[PDB]
Nucleic acid binder design. Structure first.
Ligand SMILES: Nc1ncnc2c1ncn2[C@@H]1O[C@H](COP(=O)(O)OP(=O)(O)OP(=O)(O)O)[C@@H](O)[C@H]1O
Length: 538
RNA sequence: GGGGUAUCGCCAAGCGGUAAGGCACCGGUUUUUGAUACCGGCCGCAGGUUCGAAUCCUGCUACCCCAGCCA
């Protein structure tokens, strides 16, 4: 695993610039973590463990209004669930409010900061545009003493929101818009989830992030491409205050996934408007959502490893992600029998109430042991596996042909029965009671579940949440939601599944990987989520 | 205006000496899962320097980001 960032780290180590690597994952606690965050997590924690260094978990809680304790809680859960551990205690940018406040005072004393009274609208008007330079505020020249007195007033709550703010004194004609006197502090009479109501002024991201990294001893600050401009302000702040270290920022491209949105705002909308059961709905690209869906922490790490880390914009295909969960589950998920679209089949040549047949826990792995399953003259099978008239390509059950029942006998169709609508209600067939080994020639195998002690199971089949590749680029991404993202079915599963535990995925043979969903499961009717289907192609 | 980016459908090695790999797709073998496994198939443009260019240069073109008291 190598990328431009690890090459930068190797160089620093060799040149002697650094003797140890210290990174951090700094999520703002304003929503749940998604697969995009996981990319950043593998990168940052990944780098630390490979270089025997440290990686911090720092909640960048600089905007109380959009934040909640709920999110800091779930975020820690998901980072841990992914298998990563942070260095020392969980950190919070808010742990540094007193420090940041002191640094703002240092800038003011050096005349590199001033309190501006331009309204929130006028500041945008004075900023200029992408092509036109901005102009200096009429307050820009206040004296140190006055800026000092005015900033203390901001802090003491003497100014209503937006009636004043602290700005850095840089260059209003800079081609970098972020350098046109960026706001350093803004007033918000809002309760903070960590500091309560001690503060009514809060530091902005650009002021907060570089100082927090610095204070924490960060060596390589890793973020996404949209902050490349910000790096100039990141360096300006550290170059102009009294601080011993100067971490360097390196930006890589964000992960984008086809058929889904990765914007926290848009995921929040889906949850707020109830278009998904919640942040962890199985169709969400959130970590908790992939977890419920049946994804393993190891398959997510594998994915992050495969997509690489560069500076090129990208949108990875779902197939790539699904490939990672299949490979994992294919190797470790024990097999089981279930029928999603059940049709009653009756073996007339079968006498008795039933018997017990042996079924391996993994056809390619005997070390996973075997189990006992009931077989009777009345077993459920899937509609799709039976057809009166079928070509040569079809290998399943045909009106007058015979197939091999999984881990059982070789039956043979003989007749059917249609109801009023004309839909088959029951398939009659006979079987060879001497089948359990390879004369003749059979071609085709199908799964089944005896109606004897069948377990009435609800199966949830999920699909892409959105019907277009780049829903985020649509005028209204909500209007492009896939109405079939979730299709609920009522099937039957072998009785052993009665002991399935949420968080353990089985491979329902010839149908895909599934796992119990504790949210909808009950003692009566269990609910299984289909993680992903098997590769299907004749 | 400034910051970035361009290598086979989607990702991505490469850092001037015959262009890795993964995903996808498509063939073939094995298979009592149409699965798995194992084979096989598959340098943005124009010039320039150079014995030699994906790599260095110049000039294009396309795309992404920046005009929050968000991050
Ligand atoms: N899609 C992504 N792919 C890789 N890293 C991401 C992605 N989205 C956010 N990150 C990074 O994860 C860390 C925490 O991000 P943060 O908590 O601020 O979410 P965010 O900025 O709101 O991103 P989003 O807009 O996707 O919600 C930052 O380094 C951020 O750049």
């Amino acid at each position: 695993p190598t990328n431009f960032i690890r090459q930068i780290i190797d160089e620093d180590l060799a040149s002697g610039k650094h003797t140890t690597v210290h990174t951090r994952f700094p999520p703002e606690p304003n929503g749940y973590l998604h697969i995009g965050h996981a990319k950043s997590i593998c990168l940052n924690f990944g780098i630390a463990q490979d270089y025997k260094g440290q990686c911090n978990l720092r909640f960048d809680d600089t905007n109380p209004v959009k934040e909640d304790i709920e999110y800091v809680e779930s975020i820690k859960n998901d980072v841990e669930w992914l298998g990563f551990h942070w260095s020392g205690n969980v950190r919070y940018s808010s742990d540094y409010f007193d420090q940041l406040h002191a640094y703002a005072i240092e800038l003011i004393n050096k005349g590199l900061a001033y309190v501006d009274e331009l309204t929130p609208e006028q500041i945008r008007e004075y900023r200029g545009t992408l092509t036109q330079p901005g102009k200096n505020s009429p307050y820009r020249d206040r004296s140190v003493e006055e800026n000092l007195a005015l900033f203390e007033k901001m802090r003491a709550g003497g100014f209503e929101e937006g009636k004043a703010c602290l700005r850095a004194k840089i260059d209003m004609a800079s081609p970098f818009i972020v350098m046109r006197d960026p706001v350093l502090y803004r007033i918000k009479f809002a309760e903070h989830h960590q500091t309560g109501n001690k503060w009514c002024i809060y530091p902005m991201y650009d002021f907060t992030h570089c100082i927090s990294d610095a204070l924490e001893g960060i060596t390589h600050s890793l973020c996404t491409l949209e902050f490349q401009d910000n790096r100039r302000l990141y360096d300006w702040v550290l170059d102009n205050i009294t601080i011993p270290v100067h971490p360097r920022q390196y930006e890589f491209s964000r992960l984008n996934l086809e058929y889904t949105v990765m914007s926290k705002r848009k995921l929040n909308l889906l949850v707020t408007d109830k278009h998904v059961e919640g942040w962890d709905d199985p169709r969400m690209p959130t970590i908790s959502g992939l977890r419920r869906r049946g994804y393993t922490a190891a398959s997510i790490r594998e994915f992050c490893k495969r997509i690489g880390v560069t500076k090129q914009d990208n949108t990875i295909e779902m197939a790539s992600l699904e490939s990672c969960i299949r490979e994992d589950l294919n190797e470790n998920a024990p097999r089981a029998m279930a029928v999603i679209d059940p049709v009653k089949l009756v073996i007339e040549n079968y006498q008795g109430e039933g018997e017990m047949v042996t079924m391996p826990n993994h056809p390619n792995k005997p070390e996973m042991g075997s189990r006992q399953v009931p077989f009777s003259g009345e077993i459920w099978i899937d509609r799709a596996d039976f057809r009166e008239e079928a070509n040569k390509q079809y290998k399943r059950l045909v009106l007058g042909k015979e197939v091999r029942l999984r881990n059982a006998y070789v039956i043979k169709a003989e007749r059917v029965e249609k109801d009023a609508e004309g839909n088959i209600t029951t398939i009659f067939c006979t079987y060879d009671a001497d089948t359990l080994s390879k004369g003749r020639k059979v071609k085709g195998v199908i799964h089944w579940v005896s109606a004897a002690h069948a377990l009435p199971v609800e199966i949830r089949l999920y699909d892409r949440l959105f019907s277009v590749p780049n829903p985020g680029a649509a005028d209204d991404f909500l209007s492009v939601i896939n109405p079939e993202s979730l299709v609920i079915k009522q099937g039957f599963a072998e009785p052993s599944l009665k002991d399935a535990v949420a968080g353990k995925a089985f491979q329902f043979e010839r149908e895909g990987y599934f796992c119990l969903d504790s949210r909808h499961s009950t003692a009566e009717k269990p609910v299984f989520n289909r993680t992903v289907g098997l590769r299907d192609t004749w």
